[PDB]
Amino acid sequence: TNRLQGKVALVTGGASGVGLEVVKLLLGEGAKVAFSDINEAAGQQLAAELGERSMFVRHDVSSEADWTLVMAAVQRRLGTLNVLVNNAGILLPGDMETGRLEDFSRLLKINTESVFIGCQQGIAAMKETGGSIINMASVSSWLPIEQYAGYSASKAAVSALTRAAALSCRKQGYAIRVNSIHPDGIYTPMMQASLPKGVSKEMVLHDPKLNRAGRAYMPERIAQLVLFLASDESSVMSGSELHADNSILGMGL
Amino acid sequence: TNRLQGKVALVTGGASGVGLEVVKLLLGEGAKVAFSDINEAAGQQLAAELGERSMFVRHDVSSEADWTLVMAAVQRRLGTLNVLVNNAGILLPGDMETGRLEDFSRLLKINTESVFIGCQQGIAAMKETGGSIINMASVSSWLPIEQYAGYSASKAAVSALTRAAALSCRKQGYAIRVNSIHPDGIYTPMMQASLPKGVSKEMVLHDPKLNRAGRAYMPERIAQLVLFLASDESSVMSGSELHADNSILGMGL
Amino acid sequence: TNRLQGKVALVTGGASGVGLEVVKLLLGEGAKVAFSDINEAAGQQLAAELGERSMFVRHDVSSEADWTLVMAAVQRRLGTLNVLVNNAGILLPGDMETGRLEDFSRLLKINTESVFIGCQQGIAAMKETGGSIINMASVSSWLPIEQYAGYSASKAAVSALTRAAALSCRKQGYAIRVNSIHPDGIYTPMMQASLPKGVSKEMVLHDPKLNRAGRAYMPERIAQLVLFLASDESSVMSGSELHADNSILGMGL
Amino acid sequence: TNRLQGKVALVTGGASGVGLEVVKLLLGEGAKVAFSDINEAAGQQLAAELGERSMFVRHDVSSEADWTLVMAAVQRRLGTLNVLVNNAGILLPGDMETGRLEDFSRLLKINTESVFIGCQQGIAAMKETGGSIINMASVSSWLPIEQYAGYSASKAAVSALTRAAALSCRKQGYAIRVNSIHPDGIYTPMMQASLPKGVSKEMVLHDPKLNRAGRAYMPERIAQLVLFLASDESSVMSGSELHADNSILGMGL
Q1: How far apart are the CA of A138 and the nearest CA of chain C, in angstroms?
Q2: Count: domains in chain A
Q3: Cβ neighbours of D166 in A, within 8 Å
Q4: Which among A245, B200, C28, C157 has the fewest CB atoms less than 10 Å away?
Q5: Catalytic residue of the set D148, D151, D174, D187
């Protein structure tokens, strides 16, 4: 469709997972979509396959210099940005009793500082004409999970940055919305490959008939929420969390 | 244009404001749409204009017996329900110091008991095959507004009912999502006629150039959120609040 | 002690459970305490036991006329009220699929309308001289529990009334603080008598060693939070929820 | 008067502000109290004046080595820890459009990594016999403030760490509560010196009668909430936010 034909997006962490599903949905609605990631050869092979409305750029999301260059190159090739999906992140475990400080520092650098830079530069790119900035978070930003303490904190920080960015945009008169999305588990090829032998997909995905307690969801399901926020039809929403956890709250009790 | 062709919806409060725009949007996407309204003459008038895939029904939204009849009639004419939009509600003023108990009791009857009955009977209609229940709430369910204390409370209760319904559906294996939408003000012909004489729409609508502090929004902008939640693409979301307040939190300070 | 010597309190539903523990703690710090409830002979016998600084009054908390009389009486006997504890309430079960509307209606009347009236009356009593208003709520106002859907909604409504009252007080320049307390289960003799053969206090109370998953707490523990809010030391708090659930969120997953 | 006689506390940021007021309240109830602060000239002088139950220690709160040494030194001198107040923090301004990445990194290091280390080491100190960990946050963890974007994120992260720590303690059967406190502004010589000519205590401090719009509070009023959480009477509360903003939500609108 040509629904989003005038949209120009950047999706960070866009060569796999939810990121890649987002890239595919946006392209499928006629947007132009840059995606950034760290494995350049693979990213370029992917951009070749996705076609000329897509672009790959190498990107260290924790570097301000990389972000400046990426923003400039994307917009030179594809036009003025009006969708930014801050999806790059990493998941590392560690509980409060024994988790490693060095892992927490890494989570903050990659998950939280990336969103700061991306929103800072996204506001500059979009302030004249407007747009939508979408920050990937997690259910764990509000729902504590023992073994992901630092990750939870990194994503709670992301949701605070989201509200700060959204409020600045409103107070300054920029037609920019900033919102966060909070999924539960995401059934990616990496998750599947990390499962113990003998554990199958049906054992981990939520299903109302087969696995009501399941915690994992297909990435395309999450990507649909990104597509909604990227579209003009969501524009009244700013400074909010969109929860993508299928009523986990109250389960298990 | 026939994106929602297999959807069968009931929209309460469907003849004005957000409800009216929901009926239009759903019909525009090819759904079949029944609606009711507290203003019954206004509803019958609208049905005569909207065509064969629409139907108006008389409905006391606080009556269990009338809901039973409505759910049966709608499904007899249009098929198995899979979208329910609990939008009927009333706004009455009253602060905690001087507000009237009788207004609060009426707010609870009409705003809160209606959602209880509609969700209960919506689960009965949808548990075999699935669907989406959308409860209209308000920013005021979480953001206190001095003159609308009882209304706020009625809508906070609606949000609690939303979570309980969503949880029961998950625990029972029903493919039913239940979510609430929390708008700020809704600009309508009633709002305009209500303004002091000489006040124009630009004085009450949020606008980033003209009125950054504005609290009112076009009803179609809310209806788009309802459309998303009615669509299959939003299915990972259940038990959640979608906020439609355009970053009001932090304004004014 | 004499620590709360000059406090004059009214505690509704004060003849048993958390309410009775509140009464005892307040009296123990030297306050004057009126307590209201529905069984006159029992309540009077309790007042005899508690002594001269206590007063029992029979009270239909859903009636304004009855409240007007109670407030006058209490104040005629004990002096200017500066602490109001809206503790009266009822717990009735019912899930969204099969719960009875008539039960939900009763929950709203008794749990939610009572707080509305109490808050109105309390503002009237305290607007010139100042004080604290403390509204009992529940963990279930925010944590859905499938068999207490209506109760949850009633208590979510109480929390919204709390915020509205607090905001009015601030805006109007009244030195009145209004807050809510949200306990998990309350272990009382009636709870015990309602448990199946074999389920003992030790099996339902939380204990870090014996019962980590337990959901019930002694009433005095909750009553401590009421005492804090009744004291001048808590004065910075208003419009807030005090959660008394001992880190339930995240358990069971 | 010796109500907290068996308590042994460590208070970071204890030479000024809320921390100092916390040290003094805990000492006044009979506890033993170690404190640290970046102003060692003022800190050591204070410990001298405060007596044998107080101790000052040098402490880089971002250093896992320093924490290990402080924890050991404090417990050698004063006995097993059972109260930890993570109060050390820095306020650096910066909005999302132009705030410095470097300042955000420093905010996370000092405000968020300190709480990580402090809670991890606090759990090790208290797991055998129990205690209370109190993390200082801010209203800004949930209420966006344009000029303090990074600070807000640092404190939202602190609240997430609070929940993770509290949940671990509950799941592992440790009698440790972990909670956060969220004040609005805190009036100190720092802010008052920061203030322009003629802008006095009375101009910025909230006063329920004379300055309803005021956002600044005396540190002792926040310290009272820490004292309550340090005390055994608060023990039902864990994993929670204690909001100390005096009904700011809804003001200004």
Answers
A1: 14
A2: 1
A3: 144
A4: B200
A5: D151
Interface contact flag, C236 D247, Cβ < 8 Å: no
Query: End-to-end alpha-carbon separation of chain A, Å?
Result: 44
- Tokens encoding A200: 């199958």
Are the Cβ atoms of D96 and A123 closer than 8 angstroms?
A: yes
Tokens standing for residue B142? 């979480």
- Type of residue numbered D240: S
Instruction: Tell me which chains share at least 3 CB pairs under 8 Å with chain A.
Output: B, C, D
Residues of chain B contacting A28 with CB distance shorter than 8 Å? none
Please give the residue range of the domain that contains residue C181: 1-253
CATH number for the domain harbouring residue B148: 3.40.50.720
Q: Using H for helix, E for strand and C for coil, what is the string for A50-76?
A: HCCCEEEEECCCCCHHHHHHHHHHHHH
CB A86: neighbour CB atoms within 10 A? 28
Rounded to a whole number of angstroms, the distance between the first and last alpha carbons of chain D is 45
B236–A169: do the CB atoms touch at under 8 Å? no
Pairs of residues, one from chain B and one from chain C, whose beta carbons lie less than 8 Å apart: 138
Are the CB atoms for B70 and B127 separated by under 8 Å?
no
**Residue B175 CA to chain centroid, in angstroms?**
21
C-alpha of C146 from chain center: 23
| Helices and strands counted in chain D (H then E) | 9, 9
Token output for B29: 């996407």
* A167 annotated to bind ligand: no
How many C-alpha atoms does C196 have within 13 Å on its Cβ side?
1
Chain centroid to CA B215: 18
Which residue of D124, D146, D155 is in closest CB contact with A167? Answer: D146
Q: What DSSP element (H or E) covers C57?
A: strand C54-58
In chain A, which residue's Cα lies nearest the Cα of D63? A101
Contact predicate C37/C111, CB 8 Å: no
E strand segments, D143-240:
176-183, 185-186, 216-217
Question: Is B66 annotated as a binding-site member?
Answer: no
Distance of alpha carbon B61 from alpha carbon A62, whole angstroms: 54
Both structure tokens of D166: 């509290």
Taking the C-alpha atoms of residue A15 and residue B198, their distance in angstroms, rounded to an integer, is 55
Distance from CA of C162 to the nearest CA of D (A): 10
Query: Which of these, B181, B89, B188, B84, lies nearest to B136 by C-alpha position?
Result: B181
Q: Give the span between the Cα atoms of B173 and B181, in whole angstroms.
A: 24
Of C114, C133, C127, C10, nearest in space to C64 by CA:
C114
Q: How far apart are CA D232 and CA C234, in angstroms?
A: 16
**What's B37's DSSP letter?**
-
C61 φ/ψ angles, rounded to the nearest 5 degrees: -70, -5
> Which of D144, D146, D215 is closest, CB to CB, to B249?
D144
Cβ neighbours of C162 in D, within 8 Å:
none
Q: Identify the experimental approach.
A: X-ray
Residues of chain D in contact with residue A112, where contact means CB-CB under 8 angstroms, are 108, 153, 157
Residues of C annotated as catalytic are 151
Q: Is B38 annotated for ligand binding?
A: yes
C173, C227, C240: residue with CB nearest D208: C173
Q: How many CB atoms lie within 10 A of CB B29?
A: 17
* Closest residue of chain A to B238, computed from CA coordinates: A246
- In the chain, the amino acid numbered B253 is L
Read out DSSP for chain A? --TTTT-EEEEETTTSHHHHHHHHHHHHTT-EEEEEES-HHHHHHHHHHH-TTEEEEE--TT-HHHHHHHHHHHHHHH-S--EEEE-------B-TTT--HHHHHHHIIIIIIHHHHHHHHHHHHHTTT-EEEEEE--GGGTS--TTBHHHHHHHHHHHHHHHHHHHHHHHHT--EEEEEEEESEE--HHHHHHSPTT--HHHHB-BTTTBTT--EE-HHHHHHHHHHHHSGGGTT--S-EEEESSS-TTTT-
CA dihedral C226, C230, C236, C242 (to 10 degrees): 10
- Joined together, the tokens standing for residue A170 give 């409103």
